[PDB]
């Protein structure tokens, strides 16, 4: 057994425990992030597993700082822990240096924290993936994605979850570079409706959040009325 | 973590401590160590394993270590493990002297080291020390004494005893040749040679293959010395004529 611990390399140079944690992310629902000219829009296909649950239960969109949003996929409990780690990192940076933590630096810190759970037998790798979106006058729009192994990259468009491949194809058709947040929100809604499965995983709720010039650098949930148009437009599209 | 733990300090199904028994196996193949108590002193005779021609000689001895002013010891088993215990013995003796301003009684020193050995066999998860020791010393309570302790933490006082290679056969010879209360250092040295000649399997005994130390009282003071090649060579000659 070469795949029982994170501190054991297999004969062909692989850490099977880290790869098993990635399977958990692939079982989760899709979440996409799109970076445009004015900011970043987040969209999650939140599956409603029961009618007894209230609307807004088990949200997958977090606020880790005033200007930073986080979209997650995988084990919700693992993801909530990572969100707390990120919040503390942002708060710590403000205390030590006196200003808003740059997104890239925040993504680096969290990724290394994630990377620390992939070296020992004493702990197990995190079972989730997440995206970090942000916007500031100085830095502009930023979007990063971190997976269970701890690798983090910057993206123009990203997707995580079960239909990550199908969502990626949809994202490549758009020209987000010259687009603005307002028109991108509808597109994000559209893509999630297209990749959503009907036969399996019946009934889902669309979660939307954004950060950019339109929200004055503050990450927040997309206003209900703006999400209405997007939901309407996405329904007609497909 | 649990998958790799060798569990060194647990009871086996028949109430045995495997690591302790396995360490005893290692001591049984090591160099022969014999101790004999006489009326005017004690002696230590140990077979040398380091006999290569390119080896150099610059220490006090090889298997005989002075512990304090009135005590010496010999070891059998893992050499590097013996270095750790011998250093610990020296510290125990010095700590007793710092506290009471008197040399530590022989038996008290052995008991303190046995406590450390017992601790390894009960908790901690570490492998035990693979060493068996022979102690010779003089104190104001019991005079000349001889002790032997092993990896389990057990020890005992003896008039003559042997540890290491062919110790069972050496002990047999000692039973039929040792005269209780009628032995002298000169007569003990001859017996040592006799016993050493039998247990060892290399025909000619040889002075280079052995190391002998004696402990005596001279002018109100303990004297511990390792016999030189000449004295040892002469002793071997005596056996030939004997």
């Amino acid at each position: 057994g070469y795949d029982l611990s994170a501190s054991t390399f297999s004969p062909d140079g692989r850490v099977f425990q880290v790869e098993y944690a990635m399977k958990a992310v692939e079982n989760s629902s899709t979440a996409i992030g799109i970076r445009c000219k004015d900011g970043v829009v987040f969209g999650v296909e939140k599956l409603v597993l029961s009618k007894l649950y209230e609307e807004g239960s088990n949200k997958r969109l977090f606020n880790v700082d005033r200007h930073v949003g986080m979209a997650v996929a995988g084990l919700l409990a693992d993801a909530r822990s990572l969100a707390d780690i990120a919040r503390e990192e942002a708060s710590n940076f403000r205390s030590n240096f006196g200003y808003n933590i740059p997104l890239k630096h925040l993504a680096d810190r969290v990724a290394m924290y994630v990377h620390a759970y992939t070296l020992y037998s004493a702990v197990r790798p995190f079972g989730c993936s997440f995206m970090l979106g942000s916007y500031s006058v100085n830095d502009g729009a930023q979007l990063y994605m971190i997976d269970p192994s701890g690798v983090s990259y910057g993206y123009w468009g990203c997707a995580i979850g079960k239909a990550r491949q199908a969502a990626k194809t949809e994202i490549e058709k758009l020209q987000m570079k010259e687009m603005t947040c307002r028109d991108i929100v509808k597109e994000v809604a559209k893509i999630i409706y297209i990749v959503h499965d009907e036969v399996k995983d019946k009934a889902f709720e669309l979660e939307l959040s954004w950060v950019g010039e339109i929200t004055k650098g503050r990450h927040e949930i997309v206003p209900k009325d703006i999400r209405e148009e997007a939901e309407k437009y996405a329904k007609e599209s497909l | 973590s649990r998958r790799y733990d060798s569990r060194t300090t647990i009871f086996s199904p028949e109430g045995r401590l495997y690591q302790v028994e396995y360490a005893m196996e290692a001591i049984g193949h090591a160099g022969t160590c014999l101790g004999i108590l006489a009326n005017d002193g004690v002696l230590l005779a140990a077979e040398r394993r380091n006999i290569h021609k390119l080896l150099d000689e610059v220490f006090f001895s090889e298997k005989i270590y002075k512990l304090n002013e009135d005590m010496a010891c010999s070891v059998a088993g893992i050499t590097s493990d013996a270095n750790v215990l011998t250093n610990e013995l020296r510290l125990i003796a010095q700590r007793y002297l710092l506290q009471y301003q008197e040399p530590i009684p022989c038996e008290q020193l052995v008991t303190a080291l046995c406590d450390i050995k017992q601790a390894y066999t009960q908790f901690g998860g570490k492998r035990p020390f693979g060493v068996s020791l022979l102690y010779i010393g003089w104190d104001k309570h019991y005079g000349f004494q001889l002790y032997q302790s092993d990896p389990s933490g057990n020890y005992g006082g003896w008039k003559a005893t042997c540890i290491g290679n062919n110790s069972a056969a050496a002990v047999s010879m000692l039973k039929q040749d040792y005269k209780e209360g009628e032995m002298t250092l000169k007569s003990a040295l001859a017996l040592a040679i006799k016993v050493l000649n039998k247990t060892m399997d290399v025909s000619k005994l040889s002075a280079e293959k052995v190391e002998i130390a004696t402990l005596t009282r001279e002018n109100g003071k303990t004297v511990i010395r390792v016999l030189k090649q000449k004295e040892v060579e002469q002793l071997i000659k005596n056996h030939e004529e004997e």
């Binding site: 205390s95 030590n96 240096f97 006196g98 200003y99 740059p102 890239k104 630096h105 680096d108 | -």
Partner: protein
């Protein structure tokens, strides 16, 4: 000790005296109290020489690492915050006021006073034992919109007036001008200092 820093459109001018004293004896008459924390960020030291030197080194180290992690030149406010943090945390043990001045691409020339753990941004700052004698002088002479040359002249005059009156100040005047183009050092020797009413 007398230190002073002035903000101008496009950079800062920072200067100080060169006297280190132990009671009535001058232990070092040509000490450099202007210390660089980074390429475009400087700090003026006043108070205990040991405390200030230790703080400056600790900060330079923290800022260097910070700059390599963020892949960009550190902001002047970040340098002031790092100094403020150390100064506030150890206020009971440290007896040194590290005045911060520098240039960055976001806010330009900035001067920060961080004495005792309190951070304040000012158009011009003065510190040290000798600064008490020039408060009146700087309040009446300072004018907004001064050029770097005028700022250099303004700083030299104020320091010279303090050196003449304050026993703990004297020697030469160290001067550094920081802008986007870089750091310019300058030393005004004893025989080249501004002269005022002396007798």
């Amino acid at each position: 000790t007398t230190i002073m820093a002035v903000e101008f459109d496009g950079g800062v001018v920072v200067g100080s005296d060169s006297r280190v004293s132990a009671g009535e004896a001058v232990v070092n008459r040509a000490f450099n109290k202007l210390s660089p924390l980074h390429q475009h960020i400087y700090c003026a030291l006043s108070g205990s020489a040991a405390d200030a030197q230790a703080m400056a080194d600790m900060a330079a180290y923290q800022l260097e690492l910070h700059g390599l992690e963020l892949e960009e030149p550190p902001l002047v406010l970040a340098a002031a915050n790092v100094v403020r943090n150390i100064s506030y945390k150890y206020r009971e043990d440290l007896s040194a006021h590290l005045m911060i001045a520098g240039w960055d691409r976001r806010d330009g020339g900035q001067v920060y006073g961080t004495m005792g753990g309190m951070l304040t941004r000012q158009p011009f700052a003065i510190g040290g034992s000798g600064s008490t004698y020039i408060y009146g002088y700087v309040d009446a002479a300072y004018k907004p919109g001064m050029s770097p040359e005028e700022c250099r002249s303004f700083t030299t005059n104020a320091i010279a007036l303090a050196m003449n009156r304050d026993g703990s100040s004297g020697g030469v005047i160290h001067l550094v001008t920081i802008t986007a183009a870089g750091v310019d050092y300058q030393v005004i020797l004893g025989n080249e200092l501004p002269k005022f009413y002396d007798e």
